[PDB]
């Protein structure tokens with residue numbers, strides 16, 4: 004590692020060697036140049052200890068079976084060292100270490116001098132700016148962090164709640180970059196742009212702020228100058244030796260600003276701020292950043308629901324709870340791939356319940372137009388002062404400035420990312436008055452001006468007040484009609500802001516299953532859903548798949564083998580996730596107690612999982628993924644499980660007219676039993692709706708039957724197709740048996756007729772184009788080629804290599820399609836040509852009642 008002396012240099016440390024403090028008897032020795040490190044583990048930047056150990060071989064893949072249980076965790080109850088050399092050719096410039104992401108805390112050492120202790124460098128989110136100029140010399144220098152064990156119940160850090168299983172090291176280590184900064188007499192810090200747009204969105208005012216600190220021995224004059232949004236700015240201030248000042252620039256007007264919008268509502272432009280602090284007509288330090296020109300509000304409606312708006316347009320939040328990797332393994336491409344899946348699902352938002360990602364994650368969210376809802380997490384140290392018998396320790400005096408500093412450092416990091424639409428200062432429990440005041444003060448000090456939400460539950464805080472949100476569950480199996488409930492004011496139906504809910508178990512694709520679980524584990528899964536599954540949750544409540552398995556059997560019919568269990572799981576998950584979203588889209592425009600938000604629990608999993616996910620840890624796409632994608636189409640037709648109304652939803656930024664909605668019921672033998680064609684429908688922009696028809700009680704339906712809903716635009720183009728498998732037997736709730744995480748059923752729909760749906764046929768041609776942008780698009784033309792009346796039902800197309808392995812990540816325009824005899828659809832999948840790994844592409848096509856084939860693409 005070499006760092007130049009250039010003013011404004013800020014170079015990330017690319018890697019470390021690590022070893023347990025068990026092997027280090029003299030702490031001061033480690034950071035002396037020449038300290039031997041034989042047997043130490045080389046690890047990349049942003050590594051937890053265990054991730055470093057995995058990078059070196061040292062344990063088997065924790066994504067497979069119970070491999071993670073075989074790691075001795077005692078070794079992580081003592082500190083580990085992160086060490087690097089640093090070459091400095093020229094000590095003319097001052098030298099700083101600027102970092103955050105230390106879990107839980109650290110002593111910091113340079114060339115045999117302890118520059119900071121774990122009392123100062125404490126908390127995952129706290130930022131540190133350590134001037135190490137006195138310690139640095141020309142040639143080989145050495146830097147070492149003694150990183151202390153992490154306990155999320157004790158430390159203001161990150162924990163995993165009940166999402167997965169506990170990482171053996173509790174994620175101890177350094178999970179963001181440590182920057183080596185160089186600068187002259189004056190350091191430049193905290194440069195940012197306060198931006199205020201008018202209601203017409205055609206003029207903005209910019210107030211640039213930046214701090215300058217004179218770390219030299221003598222008084223200086225400094226000039227802070229550069230550009231904001233293409234316009235020149237310059238201020239000159241005096242600084243005493245050791246003085247820090249905030250420089251405020253005179254207001255800058257910006258006409259016809261290139262306003263940042265959420266995806267689909269306009270562009271995702273960010274402007275640049277570029278500053279240099281100069282001393283004696285020579286640069287001393289420099290900083291470049293971005294900001295977006297966007298207004299956001301989050302207010303309580305007349306029903307008490309939290310209602311977001313961006314640039315004066317109200318939105319229904321449609322999102323998922325986002326999580327990083329279980330061992331905080333960072334990959335910039337992977338972050339991009341995950342946020343891109345958000346938009347392929349048609350979602351608009353992700354929630355981060357703690358685990359707040361490095362800066363690049365928010366850069367990508369900004370660039371893609373994905374809204375973000377960061378905040379502190381429940382159920383550990385963060386809520387320890389207010390959450391009673393729940394996990395997390397009561398706070399002592401030294402906790403208060405760590406929390407406040409954590410808030411200041413996150414507010415400072417997040418304030419100029421336009422994707423950020425709020426910060427949750429509480430999750431579960433709202434903070435008390437003292438803690439809340441600390442957070443509000445930190446945010447004001449950082450000019451963090453975004454909406455503050457006191458909790459994701461219905462709990463108010465003393466100052467900010469009512470949350471406008473609810474956390475009533477469920478987190479486990481409930482039938483599709485559950486989501487249409489508005490009668491139960493303590494449950495999770497479509498009304499108010501649903502900040503975290505799902506129907507629990509989300510079995511991944513067979514391809515993923517075979518990568519995460521052994522033959523014997525998979526066998527238990529379908530034979531005994533009641534058995535604990537390591538790849539569900541460490542929580543007793545969510546340790547097994549019983550509620551899911553019982554419902555699947557009741558409602559699909561008993562599983563005959565593993566393949567049967569999996570195919571049925573995919574329908575149940577598509578059916579459920581679809582209803583969850585669709586109910587919330589429908590009730591968004593209710594006059595009273597509308598739904599104002601939905602955060603699916605969860606978008607994704609920290610690892611290979613059996614629950615709470617839309618896409619799995621390998622980026623594969625199952626029935627839950629496809630069901631969410633179906634429900635969130637920009638021009639969409641849907642069927643209401645409560646009242647049988649056919650409803651059109653327009654997610655787009657423009658009102659649409661001249662639509663026709665066609666609804667047809669079929670028995671499983673293919674007989675049409677009902678048809679309705681509703682022409683001339685209009686529907687307003689940004690989540691508004693129109694009712695096409697209420698399907699009547701039709702006579703002579705098979706016990707399981709099909710509803711085919713089709714929306715066509717005024718040109719005649721089919722813009723949405725949506726096929727439901729329905730029963731003449733209702734799912735109904737035993738509401739009085741409700742617990743915090745689910746409501747049991749008093750009767751079960753009968754969808755078991757699908758077991759005996761006759762065979763149909765498809766019908767497949769595929770071709771691929773490798774583009775100059777490094778992507779390949781594969782186009783597949785599917786046709787129901789059968790000679791009878793039977794639809795080809797639930798046809799899943801997968802891009803695969805020559806070995807039949809899924810090419811991932813992948814983005815389809817549509818998938819999991821249903822085609823009546825003689826009907827054709829053309830589907831389009833896009834992925835990185837490089838992810839084929841030299842293979843020609845093929846397409847695996849599997850339908851519920853059409854078998855499996857692969858065709859060359």
Ligand SMILES: N[C@@H]1[C@@H](O)[C@H](O)[C@@H](CO)O[C@H]1O
Pocket residue numbers: 164165166356381430431478503
């Ligand atoms: N905010 C938490 C989530 O993190 C958790 O997964 C869910 C299910 O236990 O409960 C909520 O209390």
